[PDB]
Design a protein around this motif. Structure first.
Motif, mmCIF file in Angstrom:
data_model
loop_
_atom_site.group_PDB
_atom_site.id
_atom_site.type_symbol
_atom_site.label_atom_id
_atom_site.label_comp_id
_atom_site.label_asym_id
_atom_site.label_seq_id
_atom_site.Cartn_x
_atom_site.Cartn_y
_atom_site.Cartn_z
ATOM 1 N N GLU C 45 0.799 -1.225 0.000
ATOM 2 C CA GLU C 45 0.000 0.000 0.000
ATOM 3 C C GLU C 45 0.842 1.290 0.000
ATOM 4 O O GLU C 45 0.595 2.209 -0.783
ATOM 5 C CB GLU C 45 -0.968 -0.010 1.189
ATOM 6 C CG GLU C 45 -2.160 -0.945 1.023
ATOM 7 C CD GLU C 45 -3.313 -0.316 0.237
ATOM 8 O OE1 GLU C 45 -3.551 -0.736 -0.924
ATOM 9 O OE2 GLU C 45 -3.989 0.590 0.785
ATOM 10 N N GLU C 81 -6.507 12.240 6.960
ATOM 11 C CA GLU C 81 -7.534 11.205 6.804
ATOM 12 C C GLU C 81 -7.003 9.780 6.653
ATOM 13 O O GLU C 81 -7.194 8.959 7.557
ATOM 14 C CB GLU C 81 -8.432 11.495 5.623
ATOM 15 C CG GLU C 81 -9.445 10.414 5.450
ATOM 16 C CD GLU C 81 -9.990 10.407 4.066
ATOM 17 O OE1 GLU C 81 -11.040 9.765 3.851
ATOM 18 O OE2 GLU C 81 -9.363 11.054 3.192
ATOM 19 N N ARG C 82 -6.361 9.501 5.506
ATOM 20 C CA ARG C 82 -5.779 8.175 5.175
ATOM 21 C C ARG C 82 -4.815 7.616 6.242
ATOM 22 O O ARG C 82 -4.697 6.396 6.385
ATOM 23 C CB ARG C 82 -5.067 8.197 3.805
ATOM 24 N N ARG C 84 -5.408 7.548 9.123
ATOM 25 C CA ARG C 84 -6.405 6.828 9.932
ATOM 26 C C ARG C 84 -7.068 5.579 9.283
ATOM 27 O O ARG C 84 -7.296 4.569 9.967
ATOM 28 C CB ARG C 84 -7.471 7.806 10.441
ATOM 29 N N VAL C 85 -7.396 5.657 7.989
ATOM 30 C CA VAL C 85 -7.875 4.487 7.224
ATOM 31 C C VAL C 85 -6.893 3.310 7.343
ATOM 32 O O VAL C 85 -7.288 2.126 7.325
ATOM 33 C CB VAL C 85 -8.076 4.814 5.713
ATOM 34 N N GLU C 88 -6.683 2.147 11.159
ATOM 35 C CA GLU C 88 -7.711 1.090 11.113
ATOM 36 C C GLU C 88 -7.241 -0.314 10.654
ATOM 37 O O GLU C 88 -7.138 -1.235 11.478
ATOM 38 C CB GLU C 88 -8.891 1.534 10.227
ATOM 39 N N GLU C 89 -6.955 -0.470 9.355
ATOM 40 C CA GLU C 89 -6.692 -1.799 8.769
ATOM 41 C C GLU C 89 -5.564 -2.567 9.494
ATOM 42 O O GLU C 89 -5.666 -3.791 9.697
ATOM 43 C CB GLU C 89 -6.433 -1.707 7.260
#
Ligand SMILES: [Mg+2]
Ligand SMILES: [Mg+2]
Ligand SMILES: [Mg+2]
Ligand SMILES: [Mg+2]
Ligand SMILES: [Mg+2]
Ligand SMILES: [Mg+2]
Ligand SMILES: [Mg+2]
Ligand SMILES: [Mg+2]
Ligand SMILES: [Mg+2]
Ligand SMILES: [Mg+2]
Ligand SMILES: [Mg+2]
Ligand SMILES: [Mg+2]
Ligand SMILES: [Mg+2]
Ligand SMILES: [Mg+2]
Ligand SMILES: [Mg+2]
Ligand SMILES: [Mg+2]
Ligand SMILES: [Mg+2]
Ligand SMILES: [Mg+2]
Ligand SMILES: [Mg+2]
Ligand SMILES: [Mg+2]
Ligand SMILES: [Mg+2]
Ligand SMILES: [Mg+2]
Ligand SMILES: [Mg+2]
Ligand SMILES: [Mg+2]
Ligand SMILES: [Mg+2]
Ligand SMILES: [Mg+2]
Ligand SMILES: [Mg+2]
Ligand SMILES: [Mg+2]
Ligand SMILES: [Mg+2]
Ligand SMILES: [Mg+2]
Ligand SMILES: [Mg+2]
Ligand SMILES: [Mg+2]
Ligand SMILES: [Mg+2]
Ligand SMILES: [Mg+2]
Ligand SMILES: [Mg+2]
Ligand SMILES: [Mg+2]
Ligand SMILES: [Mg+2]
Ligand SMILES: [Mg+2]
Ligand SMILES: [Mg+2]
Ligand SMILES: [Mg+2]
Ligand SMILES: [Mg+2]
Ligand SMILES: [Mg+2]
Ligand SMILES: [Mg+2]
Ligand SMILES: [Mg+2]
Ligand SMILES: [Mg+2]
Ligand SMILES: [Mg+2]
Ligand SMILES: [Zn+2]
Lengths: 95, 60, 206, 23, 81, 155
Positions: C45, C81-82, C84-85, C88-89
């Motif tokens: 990623e 933002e990302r 945090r995305v 999360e994962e």
RNA sequence: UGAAACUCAAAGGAAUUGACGGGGGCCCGCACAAGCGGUGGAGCAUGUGGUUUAAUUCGAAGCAACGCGAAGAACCUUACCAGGCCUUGACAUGCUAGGGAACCCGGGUGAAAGCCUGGGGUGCCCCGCGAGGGGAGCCCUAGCACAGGUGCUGCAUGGCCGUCGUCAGCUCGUGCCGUGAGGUGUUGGGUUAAGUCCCGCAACGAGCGCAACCCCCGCCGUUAGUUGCCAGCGGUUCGGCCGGGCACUCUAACGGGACUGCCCGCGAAAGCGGGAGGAAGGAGGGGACGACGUCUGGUCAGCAUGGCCCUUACGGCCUGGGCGACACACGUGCUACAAUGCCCACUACAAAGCGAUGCCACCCGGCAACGGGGAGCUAAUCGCAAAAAGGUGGGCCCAGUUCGGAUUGGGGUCUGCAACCCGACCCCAUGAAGCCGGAAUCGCUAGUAAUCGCGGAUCAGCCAUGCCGCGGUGAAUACG
């Protein structure tokens, strides 16, 4: 005694005794040939024949390479003969 | 018989004798370490990379 | 077919571990197997970010998961933002407290993994490999170093016969225990096959 | 000797105990 | 070897203590070489697997403590030369 | 020994007669590192060297050593087409080493059942000039001599 | 004097960098010599060549393949063989036509796999008092798009490794020399373990290698003490056990010390010899580290990866067999042929490690393996544990033996779903070859070889005599 290794190839009792027969040429020198070992092997160009042999006066090592397997083997013996005559005559320069 | 293999060592079958360590990275059955979860190769790569916690070239 | 890994060879000396913690028998495997899932998730990623190195920490149900990087943007993003995305994962697999982290790297052309994956992507991009290599060293020495070395190997420019290309400026003394040699490795999968790239950066004596 | 199971030295090499090398 | 229990698979065990009950037949095919020849088997023809074939063995009280595999040998030898 | 000269180790003198020559000997008796063994043999023999032929076991030992050390030996060179056995003097170093070696060697071929007896007797006879060792000396020495005329090829 | 046919893609000259010489000079390495122990012969263990087989999967190949991949082949592993099964798959992402989901249990059947089958019933965002409902966790079937392939090519490859070789080397920049390839430097003298360093020099520098920086050991300091201690006193049930103390021993973290620095001697210098002090000197010993490159080395079967190939089959599951077959041949190893030895019984002195569905104290049954009970220990505080050779004193008396323990008969134990093929151990009986090994051939220069036991990975168990470590006792010799 004499051992032959056919590496990655399907060899035969008949050609095995042929290589036993070609190697017999070195018996000419009347000198002990100790646990001789030939290895026959394919290759994209052509075959390969190696042999490594020890004798009272030293060791023989050599590679034949050729399209025909039989001419590769002959080439191998041709190279071995030379090496053997050299171990046998080398110090005769004894003046 | 290869990737199916690594799957077959996951869910634990009829008898417990049939338990064999594979490894996590490569599916290698041979020379897996219990402590690492690793083969001797995978183990090496990682150690050298510095990804194995407190693991160092020995030297005494 | 000889040389010892210049990072592994200095672990504890010039260089230090990218997973730092303590465990003991019963859970080591698992702890470790986590890291390497984390690493895969991330390296995939977070590819076009840049980076080099991910340091990782552990206490209990606590992963610090630091990431150094080329351009932090593709992690943090718009307003954060990302960042945090991902936070999360990570946590979804971590099953524990994740902390996604971003540290910025200073002159990404002073970092080994980073310089080597550039020449790497340049080769997948069909470039003169010999020239790509002089340059990637040129860039490093210009932005300073005490010396620099770069290695590509494989069907270089697509040659049937394999070949191996080599270039270096200034010192790279891989026998010296305090080198500070940053070394990194990338991989170019081309239409014809895989080529290895190795970079070496001599930062200086400790 | 070291190969002879019936002796002390026998069991020692073999790393076992028995009548001839007891515990 | 094998201290207390007497090992028969309880698959061919079942088969022998049925066929004996009603009107005893023959031709029990098995792949279990691991099975002891238990005195309830004494006399029969069981077809035992060596791995390419099911080899028939008449049972006799001559042989009991043995295993069913011992009598259907796994290797075809015949000689050298 | 391509490079310089190869040091000759000195040796801890022994804890009975305080003499280096005894330990070297005990060293030559020794087998598979078991030195305690190698000791008792020599000393046990020394019991016997006094017991029979009442004397000074030190004396007897040190005598039969001088009765063994070869003064001249052959060492063979290739010249032209033949290998000549060549007469050369043995260094005091080599004589000791050849002294002790043949002594033991000949000792262990004696018919006596107990090792120390074998050591006892071989030494007693060598003191007197009789035995396997002594022969080997005289032998080596007649094999020199007779080659006296190859003494020019000498290094 | 002097053609031709035919035939060939050259025949040549000089010089260059190599390689080579039964050419030379100088010089290194257990290369030889000096020397100690082996192998090659025996029996057995183990790999490999063969042959054998339905299959005995596969690779590795002079040194550098052959106890190598395998740091654990009964099933599993397992890639092979035989038979019984599955297709959208054991596995990934995605889209749909039916149903449903989730989940736990039997059955019938079969060697199992599989095939056929009787159950209970889904939270949830939810029109809901209702039938019901929508979605999507998740399952199935059908359908694809696909998966999967330890199938091929290590001369298409990455990566990692072996090797020459811890050998002293390999090069670049500018300059100079040659039409040029290329030379110079890098050679020369001297010295070093070393292109190490000194001095010369159309060269002057620089880099990759040497060394050093890192670890281990040897001496001393500090910091520190539920390990050590009558060193110290007291108690002492006699166990450093209690009190008490860190001096010891140790433990494990940080320092110090070695520099040819000092003396003599030589040299132009580098540096060599010799001396002193020092636990240690001339790189204190061992490790980690191994240049540009070589072997078209090795591995597509650890992994990755281009390309070629197979898609109710070269894919996938299972039961069983095989990988352990044995006329033979080689390689590595074990145990031996005995008295410097073998056996019994009593008695000493380590190190490094490893232990929770583990290491087992101790008690008991058992000749025993083992089996019962049963305490301690996440472990410097418990356990594996015994170390062994050694020490003592007794037997053996030169015998194929009280040497050697192969082979086989029978009886047991333990692991495991299962010890036919094929496990290890224990006990009884059996006691083979072997009396020191042809041609040939290996290792080792000191705490080394030899010899002696101990631990560990892998691991249910184990075919480990293998490997990686660890201490005990402890030599011989090196002119050259
Ligand atoms: Mg297993
Ligand atoms: Mg015996
Ligand atoms: Mg022995
Ligand atoms: Mg001419
Ligand atoms: Mg010429
Ligand atoms: Mg020459
Ligand atoms: Mg000349
Ligand atoms: Mg020699
Ligand atoms: Mg010898
Ligand atoms: Mg032998
Ligand atoms: Mg033999
Ligand atoms: Mg293959
Ligand atoms: Mg070759
Ligand atoms: Mg094994
Ligand atoms: Mg199998
Ligand atoms: Mg049934
Ligand atoms: Mg290759
Ligand atoms: Mg390669
Ligand atoms: Mg190959
Ligand atoms: Mg010019
Ligand atoms: Mg030039
Ligand atoms: Mg040169
Ligand atoms: Mg050197
Ligand atoms: Mg230099
Ligand atoms: Mg304290
Ligand atoms: Mg203190
Ligand atoms: Mg170094
Ligand atoms: Mg090749
Ligand atoms: Mg592959
Ligand atoms: Mg294409
Ligand atoms: Mg199977
Ligand atoms: Mg095998
Ligand atoms: Mg043989
Ligand atoms: Mg062995
Ligand atoms: Mg404790
Ligand atoms: Mg007999
Ligand atoms: Mg006997
Ligand atoms: Mg037996
Ligand atoms: Mg039996
Ligand atoms: Mg006989
Ligand atoms: Mg005898
Ligand atoms: Mg011998
Ligand atoms: Mg012997
Ligand atoms: Mg040496
Ligand atoms: Mg085990
Ligand atoms: Mg062991
Ligand atoms: Zn792995």
């Amino acid at each position: 005694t004499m051992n032959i290794t056919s590496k990655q190839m399907e060899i035969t009792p008949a050609i095995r005794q042929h290589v036993a027969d070609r190697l017999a040429k070195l018996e000419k020198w009347q000198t002990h040939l100790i646990n001789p070992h030939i290895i026959l092997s394919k290759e994209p160009q052509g075959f390969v024949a190696d042999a490594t042999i020890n004798t009272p006066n030293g060791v023989l090592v050599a590679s034949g390479k050729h399209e025909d397997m039989y001419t590769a083997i002959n080439e191998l013996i041709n190279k071995l003969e030379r090496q053997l005559n050299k171990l046998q005559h080398k110090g005769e320069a004894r003046r | 018989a290869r990737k199916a293999l690594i799957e077959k060592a996951k869910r634990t079958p009829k008898f417990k004798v049939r338990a064999y360590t594979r490894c996590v990275r490569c599916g290698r059955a041979r020379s897996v370490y219990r402590f690492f979860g690793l083969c001797r190769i995978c183990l090496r790569e990682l150690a050298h990379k510095g990804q194995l916690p407190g693991v160092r070239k020995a030297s005494w | 077919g000889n040389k010892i890994h210049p990072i592994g060879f200095r672990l504890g000396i010039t260089r230090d571990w990218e997973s730092r913690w303590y465990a003991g028998k019963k859970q080591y495997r698992h702890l470790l197997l986590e890291d390497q899932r984390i690493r895969g998730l991330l390296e995939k990623e977070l590819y076009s970010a840049g980076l080099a190195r991910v340091d990782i920490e552990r206490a209990a149900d606590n992963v610090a998961v630091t990431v150094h990087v080329a351009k932090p943007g593709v992690v943090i993003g718009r307003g954060g933002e990302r960042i945090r995305v991902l936070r999360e994962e990570l946590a979804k697999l971590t099953g524990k407290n994740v902390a996604l982290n971003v540290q910025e790297v200073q002159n990404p052309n002073l970092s080994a993994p980073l310089v080597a994956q550039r020449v790497a992507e340049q080769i997948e991009r069909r470039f003169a490999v010999r020239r790509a290599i002089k340059q990637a060293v040129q860039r490093v020495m210009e932005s300073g170093a005490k010396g620099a070395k770069v290695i590509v190997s494989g069907r270089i420019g697509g040659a049937e016969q394999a070949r191996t290309e080599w270039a270096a400026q200034g010192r790279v003394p891989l026998h010296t225990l305090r080198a500070n040699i940053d070394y990194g490795f990338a991989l170019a999968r081309t239409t014809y096959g895989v080529l290895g790239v190795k970079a070496y950066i001599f930062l200086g004596e400790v | 000797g070291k190969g002879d199971r019936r002796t002390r030295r026998g069991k020692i090499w073999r790393g076992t105990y028995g009548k001839y090398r007891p515990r | 070897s094998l201290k207390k229990g007497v090992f028969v698979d309880d698959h061919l065990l079942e088969k022998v203590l049925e066929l004996n009950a009603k009107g005893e037949k023959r031709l029990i095919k098995t792949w279990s070489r691991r099975s002891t020849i238990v005195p309830e088997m004494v006399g029969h023809t069981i077809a035992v697997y060596n791995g390419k074939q099911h080899v028939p063995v008449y049972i006799t009280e001559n042989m009991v403590g043995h295993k069913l595999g011992e009598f259907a040998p796994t290797r075809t030898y015949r000689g050298h030369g | 020994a391509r490079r310089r000269r190869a040091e000759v180790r000195q040796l801890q003198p022994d804890l009975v007669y305080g003499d280096v020559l005894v330990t070297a000997f005990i060293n030559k008796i020794m087998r598979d590192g078991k030195k305690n063994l190698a000791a008792r043999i020599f000393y046990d023999a020394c019991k016997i060297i006094q017991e029979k032929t009442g004397q000074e076991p030190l004396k007897v030992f040190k005598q039969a050593v001088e009765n063994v050390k070869p003064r001249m030996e052959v060492r063979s060179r290739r010249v032209g087409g033949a290998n000549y056995q060549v007469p050369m003097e043995v260094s005091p170093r080599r004589q000791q080493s050849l002294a002790l070696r043949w002594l033991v060697q000949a000792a262990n071929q004696r018919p006596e059942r107990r090792a120390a007896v074998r050591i006892a007797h071989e030494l007693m006879d060598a003191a007197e000039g009789k035995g396997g060792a002594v022969k080997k000396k005289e032998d080596v020495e007649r094999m020199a001599e007779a080659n006296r005329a190859y003494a020019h090829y000498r290094w």
